[PDB]
Write a protein that binds this ligand. Sequence first.
Ligand code: HEM
Ligand code: HEM
Lengths: 137, 137
Amino acid sequence: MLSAQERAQIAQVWDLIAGHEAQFGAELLLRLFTVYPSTKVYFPHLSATQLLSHGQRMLAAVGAAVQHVDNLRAALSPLADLHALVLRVDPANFPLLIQSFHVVLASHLQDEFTVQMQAAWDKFLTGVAVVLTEKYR
Amino acid sequence: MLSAQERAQIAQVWDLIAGHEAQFGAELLLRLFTVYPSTKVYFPHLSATQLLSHGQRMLAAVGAAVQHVDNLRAALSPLADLHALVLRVDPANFPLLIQSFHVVLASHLQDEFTVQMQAAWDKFLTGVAVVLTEKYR
Ligand code: HEM
Ligand code: HEM
């Protein structure tokens, strides 16, 4: 449950990502793989231009989720099935990705990525992660 | 157990912090308080110049720990007693601080804070946190 101010804040973060999905997503994956090498097993194909492609897909889906905070479970249902049932992504990986995403955004946006924006963004992404992991057995 | 390359990497990170302990530490606390408001209960006195003072103390201790990775338990013993026994800081707060610290460093250092440096820094700070929490009952 995001407040109106929090929804405005995550829209502001997204406006700073739009157009950079591939580059920011590739850097997110690189940071995740280096700081948490256990995550590399999920991406044997990516383990450099293929990084840009997957990064683009991933962050484009994040942008779509911003437009659907009120019905995230319905809108993300295919992606939830994919991560929980088909890919079998251990839910513990999702906080590692979210923390890594904050670092990449801070590196590019510096003080434009304010602590208020980070709090809202973290709440939003934690909710996305719940949807993408709750079907995991 | 940090490798020689990892020790070189954390020395490089510290060289980029030195002189900015107060400012970076204050921003670390502000980010921690905003993204994780549950942490504010530990700092009723700080909850703005007092932020600079505490930030300075905290990050100066980090710098001292860099010089003592081989005998962290002995060198940090007073600080371990303080956090675990006197302040009773719940160990779950330490990952929140470490993640917040990466974000603050990225915001200021941008791509100079490389993913290799972050991996080494994270390993180092996770070890500091183990020392500062293992006495907690
Ligand atoms: C907010 C969190 C996440 C979002 C929005 C997201 C989004 C996506 C999307 C849209 C795809 C489709 C790629 C395609 O069909 O080409 C995908 C695939 C994939 N995701 Fe995620 N993902 C997230 C978290 C994770 C995490 C934490 C992991 C593992 C650590 C992961 C591992 C994978 C893998 C292995 C694939 C398949 C890649 C491929 O087949 O090329 N994802 N993800
Ligand atoms: C790498 C991790 C940490 C380091 C190196 C560190 C370092 C320090 C130092 C050097 C002091 C002494 C301040 C003084 O005597 O004036 C201190 C005090 C304190 N620390 Fe930490 N700290 C760490 C983590 C934490 C965390 C995670 C919390 C709580 C969320 C915390 C809460 C406190 C509090 C409440 C004080 C007392 C402040 C005061 O009395 O003014 N510390 N810390």
